[PDB]
Design an enzyme around this catalytic site. Sequence first.
Site, short mmCIF file in Angstrom:
data_model
loop_
_atom_site.label_atom_id
_atom_site.label_comp_id
_atom_site.label_asym_id
_atom_site.label_seq_id
_atom_site.Cartn_x
_atom_site.Cartn_y
_atom_site.Cartn_z
N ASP A 165 0.90 -1.41 0.72
CA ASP A 165 0.07 -0.05 -0.29
C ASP A 165 0.83 1.27 -0.16
OD1 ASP A 165 -2.29 1.98 0.22
OD2 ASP A 165 -2.59 1.65 2.32
N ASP A 200 -1.07 5.70 -5.76
CA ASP A 200 -1.80 4.69 -4.50
C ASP A 200 -2.05 3.61 -4.82
OD1 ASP A 200 -2.93 3.97 -2.24
OD2 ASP A 200 -3.99 5.01 -2.10
C1 LIG Z 1 -3.44 3.28 8.73
O1 LIG Z 1 -4.80 2.98 8.19
C2 LIG Z 1 -4.93 2.55 6.40
C3 LIG Z 1 -6.77 2.81 6.64
C4 LIG Z 1 -7.27 2.17 5.30
C5 LIG Z 1 -5.83 1.85 4.09
C6 LIG Z 1 -6.73 1.63 2.51
C7 LIG Z 1 -6.75 0.44 2.68
C8 LIG Z 1 -7.40 -0.20 4.40
C9 LIG Z 1 -8.31 -2.06 3.59
C10 LIG Z 1 -7.67 -2.51 2.38
C11 LIG Z 1 -7.50 -1.12 0.87
C12 LIG Z 1 -7.96 -2.20 -0.37
C13 LIG Z 1 -8.95 -2.83 0.10
C14 LIG Z 1 -8.69 -3.14 -1.62
C15 LIG Z 1 -7.97 -3.38 -2.64
N1 LIG Z 1 -6.97 -2.70 -2.05
C16 LIG Z 1 -6.73 -2.40 -0.80
F1 LIG Z 1 -5.38 -1.55 -0.59
C17 LIG Z 1 -7.22 -1.05 1.40
C18 LIG Z 1 -7.37 2.12 2.19
O2 LIG Z 1 -6.52 3.62 1.32
C19 LIG Z 1 -5.89 2.87 0.97
N2 LIG Z 1 -4.96 3.09 0.50
N3 LIG Z 1 -5.14 2.22 2.09
C20 LIG Z 1 -4.41 1.71 4.87
C21 LIG Z 1 -4.37 2.21 6.24
#
Ligand SMILES: COc1ccc([C@@]2(c3cccc(-c4cccnc4F)c3)COC(N)=N2)cc1
Length: 372
Positions: free
Chosen positions: A34, A220
């Site tokens: 991520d 992202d």
């Molecule tokens: C530290 O807190 C967070 C909160 C949300 C995230 C998410 C996240 C959390 C959980 C799942 C996902 C996700 C879902 C589907 C596809 N890809 C993803 F990365 C994404 C949301 O936006 C991003 N970039 N990461 C990451 C860290």
Amino acid sequence: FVEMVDNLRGKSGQGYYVEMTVGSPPQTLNILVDTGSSNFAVGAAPHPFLHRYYQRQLSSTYRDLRKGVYVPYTQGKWEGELGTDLVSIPHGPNVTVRANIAAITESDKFFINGSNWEGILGLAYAEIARPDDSLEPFFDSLVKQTHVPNLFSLQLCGAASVGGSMIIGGIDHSLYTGSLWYTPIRREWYYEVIIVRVEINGQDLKMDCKEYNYDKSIVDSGTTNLRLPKKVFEAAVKSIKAASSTEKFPDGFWLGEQLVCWQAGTTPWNIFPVISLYLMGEVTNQSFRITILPQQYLRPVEDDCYKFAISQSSTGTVMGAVIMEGFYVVFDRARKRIGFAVSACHVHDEFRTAAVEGPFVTLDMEDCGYNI
Ligand SMILES: COc1ccc([C@@]2(c3cccc(-c4cccnc4F)c3)COC(N)=N2)cc1
């Protein structure tokens, strides 16, 4: 870096994950990659959606930081307990680092029912780390404790199983063609960049370029869609509608409220326009452009049909998987810049390719960034 090629896996819409080990002896977990977040955060309790979870009681090297963390967000929440432990990446560099780990103890709409990952590797910068910028991100720790060069690159390939490569500490030149073109990281928090112009089939949208970056534009890997500010999305859809007049579609399709279907292998890519984003270049008055095909913004829905994977945002522009799957993306943290090259694995046809082209002349590029 052959050992790192093809170290990413996933399912469509559920993100890309890399294998990691945490603790002593090593506990293997699949961890979502991520670039839009900065915490290393792993399931630490038996949530029924999870294949596995970090069991701190089994790790001799685990250290409690005796601090909790609570993170609400747009589409859910998680909460957990901060500590450190030894971390490695089997299909990464041959090193073991002491990193911060948020052991996730409660969540809502965080984990995905059906996915094969159990935590998130936040690769962005300390400033957006929870609870605060004192919690050193994983990659910062990696660079501090080893000779791993301060950069990583991502090749996200798409197709339903998907795959890709995260090359940690470098660049593998077989994963792209043509040249890398670099845009400056405007500020080290998210991987923020500046989009200076937008074209639909070469046709300039002709908006004030500040609107393209209101209030932010980011790269992202943790977001599926290309997300555009409301106003930009409005104009973009209108021009996409126009360019694709050959067939007609209900208002819900563009808004991501319903799908649109064809017969197998008959899908008419040619009636859909390419989308070009011009990015701030490395030199004064110099830009470059990245261009994607409808194979990047019309995504298969298996559970031939397709969803429109451009959507509206109130958080800025988000260059998610829709953009990243066209390109090899180099996160060159050492030099505060991000590189784009055409990806050796991107999905295309015989008429059109995803492209990275330059240089172009673009004035007042600094004025395109949003200020508080
Ligand atoms: C530290 O807190 C967070 C909160 C949300 C995230 C998410 C996240 C959390 C959980 C799942 C996902 C996700 C879902 C589907 C596809 N890809 C993803 F990365 C994404 C949301 O936006 C991003 N970039 N990461 C990451 C860290």
